[PDB]
Design an enzyme around this catalytic site. Structure first.
Site: not given
Ligand SMILES: COc1ccncc1NC(=O)c1ccnc(NC(=O)C2CC2)c1
Length: 346
Positions: A31-33, A50, A146
């Site tokens: 939902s964030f993007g 992100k 969360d």
């Molecule tokens: C879906 O991930 C997020 C959701 C919301 N905000 C931030 C993040 N995600 C992150 O901040 C984030 C940071 C560093 N590495 C990953 N790696 C992965 O996701 C690998 C497993 C594939 C995700």
């Protein structure tokens, strides 16, 4: 091919620098993007970018919160920058985070589909590091709101866990109300389910407790696609919240009709192989009364984690355990004497 941006480093003074990255792939929507992955040209290091619509009045709360977080169990904000792409005239904020290859969610599901349980040493490691990240963010008054398996990053090689997704995180102020509708299915504290707006950081602890239970059970402990089903599942384990217990969460949900059930023995909830210290920790996390739940630091000090404090302990892959003891004054502030337990003689 190569994208070059002028990005502000996450930490220190606001002094931007030309950063170049390539090999962009999508690794997440929400939902964030969107979350992209990319490779920095400077170091070859992998990052998650992100990208969120930036609007527009005020500063992005997530950015403000991540810029002041610095911790080995929290995802690292290397840079951030602004850009276009989609919308047009609308401006985007990009958070450049150190990439972590796995999650508790993906790892747990591998075990669950193999009909096996994650070995308890990993439960100890992951849970302990989660409680550290909480002890830390709670020391600034920040609630994540969360906590769930998908927001728990893992390096499988080093067994380091990093908490991520501060999209919902907020600085909780006593007497200033907060939206109740945060936090995800299965992990919602009962006061959230009852729609309380005066909750505390102890909702992070309930969620962590649900994560612990799930890691032992191999499936969520409080499933349900609605609040009323989750609540039933909670009542089946914890018993019916008393009128007082209800009050300690209730916008007066007293007078309502709750299924009457006596507290099922916690030992009967898990496999017989399950260590008693694991179960004891759960029952101190998953409490109706929010103030009765362990604080994150107290949980780190729980006897369930003693094996982590053995000088001879090693990872199954033969390597050593990550730095589990480098506590700061900040981290310990909610209970400084716990340092006696938290920092073992070595
Ligand atoms: C879906 O991930 C997020 C959701 C919301 N905000 C931030 C993040 N995600 C992150 O901040 C984030 C940071 C560093 N590495 C990953 N790696 C992965 O996701 C690998 C497993 C594939 C995700």
């Amino acid at each position: 091919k190569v994208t070059t941006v002028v990005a502000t480093p996450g930490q220190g003074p606001d002094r931007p620098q030309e950063v170049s990255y390539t090999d962009t792939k999508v690794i997440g929507n929400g939902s964030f993007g969107v979350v992209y992955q990319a490779k920095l040209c400077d170091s070859g290091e992998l990052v998650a970018i992100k990208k969120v619509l930036q609007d527009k009045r005020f500063k992005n709360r997530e950015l403000q919160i991540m810029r002041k977080l610095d911790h080995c169990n929290i995802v690292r904000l290397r840079y951030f920058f602004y850009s276009s792409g989609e919308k047009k005239d609308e401006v985007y904020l990009n958070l450049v985070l150190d990439y972590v290859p796995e999650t508790v969610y993906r790892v747990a599901r591998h075990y669950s589909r193999a009909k096996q349980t994650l070995p308890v040493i990993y439960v100890k490691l992951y849970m302990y590091q989660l409680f550290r990240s909480l002890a830390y963010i709670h020391s600034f008054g920040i609630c994540h709101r969360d906590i769930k398996p998908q927001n728990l990053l893992l390096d499988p090689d080093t067994a380091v866990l990093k908490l991520c997704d501060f999209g919902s995180a907020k600085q909780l102020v006593r007497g200033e109300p907060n939206v109740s509708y945060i936090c995800s299915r299965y992990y919602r504290a009962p006061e959230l389910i009852f729609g309380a707006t005066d909750y505390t950081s102890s909702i992070d602890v309930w969620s962590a407790g649900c994560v612990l239970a799930e890691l032992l059970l191999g499936q969520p402990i409080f499933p349900g696609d609605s609040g009323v089903d989750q609540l039933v599942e909670i009542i089946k384990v914890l018993g019916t919240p008393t009128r007082e217990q209800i009050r300690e969460m209730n916008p007066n949900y007293t007078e309502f009709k709750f299924p009457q059930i006596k507290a099922h023995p916690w030992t009967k909830v898990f496999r017989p192989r399950t260590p008693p210290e694991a179960i004891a920790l759960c029952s101190r996390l998953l409490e109706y009364t929010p103030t009765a739940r362990l604080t994150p630091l107290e949980a780190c000090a729980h006897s369930f984690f003693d094996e982590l404090r053995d000088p001879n302990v090693k990872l199954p892959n033969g390597r050593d355990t990550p730095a589990l003891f480098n506590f700061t004054t900040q981290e310990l502030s909610s209970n400084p004497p716990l340092a006696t337990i938290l920092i073992p003689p070595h």
